[PDB]
A paper describes a structure:
Structural analyses of two glycoside hydrolase family 92 α-mannosidases, BT3130 and BT3965, together with mechanistically relevant complexes at 1.8–2.5 Å resolution reveal conservation of the global enzyme fold and core catalytic apparatus despite different linkage specificities. Most enzymes within family GH92 are exo-acting α-mannosidases that are capable of hydrolysing terminal mannosidic residues with a variety of linkages, including α-1,2, α-1,3, α-1,4 and α-1,6 glycosidic bonds. Complementary to α-mannosidases within largely eukaryotic mannosidase families (particularly GH38 and GH47) that play important roles in N-glycan processing, GH92 enzymes are metal-dependent, featuring a single Ca2+ ion coordinated within the catalytic active site. GH92 enzymes act via a classic single-displacement mechanism, leading to inverted configuration at the anomeric centre.
The three-dimensional structures of BT3130 and BT3965 both reveal a two-domain enzyme that appears to be well conserved with published examples of GH92 α-mannosidases. Indeed, quantitative structural comparison using the DALI server shows that the three-dimensional structures of BT3130 and BT3965 have high similarity, with an r.m.s.d. of 1.4 Å mapped over 738 matched Cα positions (sequence identity = 40%, Z-score = 48.7). Like the members of the exo-α-mannosidase families GH38 and GH47, GH92 enzymes are metal-dependent, and a single calcium ion is observed coordinated within the active sites of both BT3130 and BT3965. Interestingly, however, while Ca2+ derived from the bacterial expression host was consistently observed within previous structures of BT3990, both BT3130 and BT3965 showed a somewhat reduced ability to bind and sequester this required divalent cation. Therefore, to ensure observation of the true, catalytically competent forms of these enzymes, and the determination of meaningful ligand complexes, BT3130 was screened for crystallization with the addition of 10 mM calcium acetate (final concentation) to the protein buffer (in addition to avoiding K+-containing screen hits), while the subsequent ManI complexes of both enzymes were cryoprotected with the addition of 1 mM Ca2+ (final concentration) to the cryoprotectant solutions. Within BT3130, the 580-loop is positioned lower, and projects into the +1 subsite at a steeper angle, leaving a larger solvent-exposed space at the outer surface of the substrate-binding cavity. Furthermore, the hydrophobic ‘roof’ of this subsite is contributed by Trp67 (rather than Trp88 as in BT3990) and appears shifted some 2.5 Å towards the outer surface. BT3130 and BT3965 are found together within the same clade, and are distinct from previously published structures of the α-1,2-specific enzymes BT3990 and BT2199.
Numbering used by the authors:
A (entry chain A), B (entry chain A): 19 to 576, 579 to 735
Write the structure that this text describes.
């Protein structure tokens, strides 16, 4: 049954916002799993934070089809190498959603101004286009090398670029550009299925007719093919971070032929194998939401090395991975360490080895592990050193092919070598970040303490007992900001005094406040490695339960743009809250976890363009759905335990390595049955409120008996 | 006799200006012939156009010793990797010229604030330092990665950089920076002869004590070695355009040992072999001026490829030359095609093969040959496509190892593929550049017509007869701007009308005027490939002679900063005039050439800091002296003829390939004997006013009979 699973993915979920609500910043264009190429229309001349992927569902004009982007980020970048079909040298066109389709590996739209049909597909490193022009009209392609994310942010400018016509069917070039990533070099090689008859190249006002090459900072091409009289024009475009030669080789290996439908079909088969890793059973809407979410987790991290292994490293030099390896980038770690990376350990252990290796390369050539990585380099966005949980998690779980001593070097040195937002001599001297020395101090203290717990766990695994003590002590530094009267984590200055005045509802931004894109209410819960300690500090399990109740019911509104989708003070759009609904289990009240998780799944996710309660954040919003719908969530994303919530779907099957399955099953009378009555794992009654990574990866079956009313299970 | 020739070089010639006069923009620090490293003190925090090499003789403060620069340019760039010795973390110091020495491959200065002695030398790709601290004082080195040319020009900013301490004796890093060259990557590897005891790294206000690495845009290091108590600190620094690994390898191969005096001695031996290629006899002052000029021609073009052959190409990718090859850059072509490159065909034919190959690489990866090349890429400074005369000249003269068909491809395509300041479809449609379509139109028309003559000559050599006609016709386009009433070359618009009003004294700049850094009086003479045509147009030899007389005696003053050193309207500081004193030969009055050449040599060159009548322009001012002092000059620098002037020196011997000499000899009673009475070449009386390249390269002897009064020779 071809398209059995892929037919459920709706790439328009998360591409817009309804009224003035919240968008995922997802894109509907074609891509391949963990690919280099995201071939998609831009509905803006210059993508910005409100439409960072390049597309907005509320818009009606397409300004070209570019080949790279981020999914669900709060800042725009990439947007490289932009083609537009036309008959009269035009650069934009109207379109309607009524004449537009999208599915895994495929996008189509009718461009209405000149009645030209556009279809897109991809391979791992190539974009394939097919354009159908009216019979009797001239066929032309415009290449725009200036089109990019907004040039008024990040000091973004094109340093240099080239367009070069090699023969009548081939064009190469490149651009070097600054932005959110400090410096990116994007090389291309392009071919046409019909010969170029005439052409024009320009750089701003400087125009050159039928000229084989141009160099500059504001380049544009127009290639004219004449009357095609019903033959569609097929275009192929390969990219590289290193060279035009590599891009050409990427095309020779992955995309040598000219059969468009064959490319489309392979892309669909590829997505069917990927999405097939979790087979689910539920309503038609739930399958659409679930498979679309699973898709969003699998469109990055992005392939960066070429088919010959070469890539631009973090010291801006050209290097090569081994034959069986792939260098990846796009690591939105402040979001993705929480759920996306745990999800990859279940579904993509072979890729996780390459992700870890890619992170370690930043250490090897830049001096510390990635904080937030984009086009092979760090941009320091957000806080923490959250490569560390990801590398730790992979090693403790036994993901194969990782050099452990080298990984520990990287992790250790990243934790003792001070760098922006990590003053480690301040850290160990005070036992916290003082707000007057390091801003975002309370968020950093909580998140960094968690990173240190991870280092400790890795030290213990390698019998490095002195290191263990050092990092274990550091992991307990959250205590130094716990205020004993108010029972919030609050900021202190270097004299050890509590900053006055303090309001736990007050949102901070990305500096000038002790919290990062949230308030003290939301950050209170961030001790994922020692919830028992946190419970004790709050005044015991009963006290901790009541504080959670206040958190989930208190509707006061002070503000920050990123935090949205509210259940009291709980904002599902920002990921400090994401683990919190699972904390009622720890308090002795699992039914409350089941209640709130079910509320969020049913109420804050949907199958319209709005889709999500905030930016998808490289699929972290989606990974939350994937996990929670299956019925468990990695509260501590480095301890290899998944905390039970409430399974949404009737059944899920995880297709694992190799010949193995983890089968999740439900006994229910209706969808109102959201409370767990009991759980069985491999025939034995299951008394804990978690399952382990080993429980899943061994293969087996887990059965949930559900009911309409709270049971008493784990109570 | 060690230092027989090197003792004559005075690196302070051209480093200053006296009253408000004119400087060469030369530098006194250490370098090697055609090297990668120019290790020299900067007397400014941020070098600008008034001190573009980094040093000014009128200054009394040193702000560090950097490792790269240009010699004699009108804009600053490079200035990379800056060390400063100190005992108390200081960044600047007073010095006096009384306690400062310099000679080929060596610089020394006493830094007076803390009484520290600095000595510098180089290899091809390494800089070697030796610092002597007072006994009883702490030894420290500051590394400054922000120090550069003025950041308010060219949009210059550091994109990213690194300092990284590898062990107690080794530091690596890099910087990526924009400027006059669009994008440069400079990687380094450094070692110390004593172990680092403590250290600090910072990025702006962010300071990290005893921390092994830092990344950012404004980086500074301080390394502390303790009390050395009389042991000098030796530092070694290698560079690369590609990687830290390559830089380290450059040090392993060229500079593995720790004997400073041995490095100094090899640098001096290397310079003695180079300067020894012309052995001269004259007064002590003339030998100082001559050998210093010869030195200035040999400090660039600069080595860019590492010892493994790797280099950054003009498409910003990493490539590799063959084993026996070297990739070079720093091609100040608008100046250097005139005399410097002709000089290299006599003295450096083996290097010229590599220069030509390096130029062709820009064509291969960027689409046309270099106009003005800097750190492996074009910056378009000035006008013309003046790689073309250089490549043409080398091929016609039979410089070996140049692929001629590939070279012709590069030359041809660079002459028909339009690009900035070369609208070739405008060129062939109008038979000139119309000022209202292309500015600097008269200068471009004259200089481009000369480039086209060169292409024609190359076409004829390869029996490409259609091409010959095309480019020969183009070479005659100077005629289309010759005004028949006024007898100047003047600007026209696209309707073919002469622009009114027109003043032949009025200087233009680099746009908005039809002349480039000069007036119509100075550009009038630029038809070096058809002086007979120019003579006819002026009204015959008598008329042409009289126009030259007016040019050399008319003292009116309107203005431009670059044009200076005046003999009437003749300005020796700018190179459009440079061939003009030799034109009296063509008019039938060689004594007048001999008079004016002798005046310029004796009056506009000197052995003080001012030194030259304008910027040295990568040794073009110096190459003029070298040629003219020997007694001939390449008026047409692609026809292989050297036009006779007046020999200044008693004797010169050119030491050629191999076992061959060209011996130039004079019969004279005193230095007042400046007029040529007769000339002998290989025993036969020499009736022409030129000698050929073959006459010189075959070896032989040329004798000038001189006298106090004009003779009648060639009259
Ligand atoms: Ca978010
Ligand atoms: Ca000049």
């Amino acid at each position: 049954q071809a398209g059995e699973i892929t037919k459920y993915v709706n790439p328009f979920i998360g591409t817009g916002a309804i009224d003035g609500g919240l968008s995922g910043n997802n894109y509907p264009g074609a891509t391949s799993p963990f690919g280099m190429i995201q071939l998609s229309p831009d509905t803006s001349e210059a993508p910005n934070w409100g439409d960072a992927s390049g597309y907005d569902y509320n818009r009606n004009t397409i300004f070209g089809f570019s080949h790279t982007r981020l999914s669900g980020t709060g800042a725009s970048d990439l947007i490289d190498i932009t083609l537009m079909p036309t008959s009269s040298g035009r650069t934009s066109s109207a379109f309607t959603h009524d004449e537009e389709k999208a599915r895994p590996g495929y996008y189509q739209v009718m461009l209405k101004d000149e009645n030209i049909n556009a279809e897109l597909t991809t391979t791992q490193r190539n974009g394939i286009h097919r354009y159908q022009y009216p019979a009797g009209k001239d066929a032309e392609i415009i290449l725009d090398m200036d089109h990019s994310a907004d040039k008024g942010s990040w000091g973004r400018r094109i340093i240099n670029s080239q367009i070069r016509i090699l023969n009548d069917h081939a064009v190469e070039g490149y651009r070097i550009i600054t932005g959110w990533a400090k410096l990116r070099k994007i090389y291309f090689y392009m071919e046409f299925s019909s010969p170029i008859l005439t052409s024009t190249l320009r750089d701003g006002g400087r125009v050159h007719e039928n000229t084989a090459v141009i160099n500059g900072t504001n380049l544009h091409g127009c290639f004219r093919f004449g009357q095609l009289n019903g033959k569609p024009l097929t275009c192929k475009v390969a990219l590289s971070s290193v060279s035009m030669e590599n891009a050409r080789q990427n095309m020779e290996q992955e995309a040598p032929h000219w059969d468009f439908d064959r490319y489309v079909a392979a892309a669909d088969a590829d997505w069917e194998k990927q999405l097939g890793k979790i087979e689910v059973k539920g309503t038609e809407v739930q399958k659409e939401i679930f498979y679309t979410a699973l898709y969003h987790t699998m469109i990055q991290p992005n392939t960066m090395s070429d088919v010959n292994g070469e890539y631009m490293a973090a010291d801006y030099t050209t290097r090569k991975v081994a034959n069986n390896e792939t260098h990846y980038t796009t690591f939105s770690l402040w979001d993705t360490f929480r759920a996306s990376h745990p999800l990859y350990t279940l579904l993509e252990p072979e890729r996780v080895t390459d992700f870890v290796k890619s992170m370690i390369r930043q250490y090897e050539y830049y001096g510390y592990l990635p904080i937030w990585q984009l086009w092979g380099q760090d941009n320091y966005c957000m806080i923490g050193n959250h490569s560390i949980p990801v590398i730790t998690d992979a090693i403790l779980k036994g993901i194969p092919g990782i050099d452990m001593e080298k990984a520990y070097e990287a992790v250790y040195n990243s934790s003792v070598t001070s760098h922006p937002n990590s003053p480690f001599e301040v850290w160990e001297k005070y036992g916290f970040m003082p707000e007057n020395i390091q801003t975002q101090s309370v968020s950093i203290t909580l998140e960094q303490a968690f990173d240190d717990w991870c280092v400790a766990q890795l030290a213990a695994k390698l019998n490095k007992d002195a290191d263990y003590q050092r990092f274990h002590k550091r992991s307990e530094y959250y205590r130094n900001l716990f205020h004993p009267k108010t029972k919030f984590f609050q900021s202190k200055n270097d004299k050890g005094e509590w900053i006055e005045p303090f309001d736990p509802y007050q949102y901070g931004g990305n500096g000038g406040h002790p919290f990062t894109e949230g308030n003290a209410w939301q950050y209170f819960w961030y001790v994922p490695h020692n919830i028992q300690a946190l419970m004790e500090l709050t005044g015991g399990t009963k006290a901790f339960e009541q504080k959670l109740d206040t958190f989930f019911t208190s509707t006061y509104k002070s503000m920050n743009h990123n935090a949205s989708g509210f259940v009291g003070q709980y904002a599902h759009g920002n990921e400090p809250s994401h683990h919190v609904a699972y904390l009622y289990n720890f308090a002795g009240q699992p039914w409350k976890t089941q209640k709130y998780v079910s509320h969020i799944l049913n109420t804050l996710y949907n199958n319209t363009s709005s889709g999500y309660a905030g930016n998808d954040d490289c699929g972290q919003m989606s990974a939350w759905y994937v996990f929670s719908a299956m019925g468990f969530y990695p509260v501590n994303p480095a301890d290899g335990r998944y905390i039970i919530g409430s399974p949404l779907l009737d059944e899920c099957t995880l297709k694992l390595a190799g010949n193995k399955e983890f089968r999740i099953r439900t006994i229910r009378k209706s969808p109102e049955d959201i409370y767990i009555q009991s759980v069985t794992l491999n025939g034995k009654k299951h008394k804990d409120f978690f399952i382990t990574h080993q429980d899943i990866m061994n293969g087996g079956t887990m059965v949930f008996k559900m009911g309409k009313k709270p049971s008493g299970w784990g109570k």
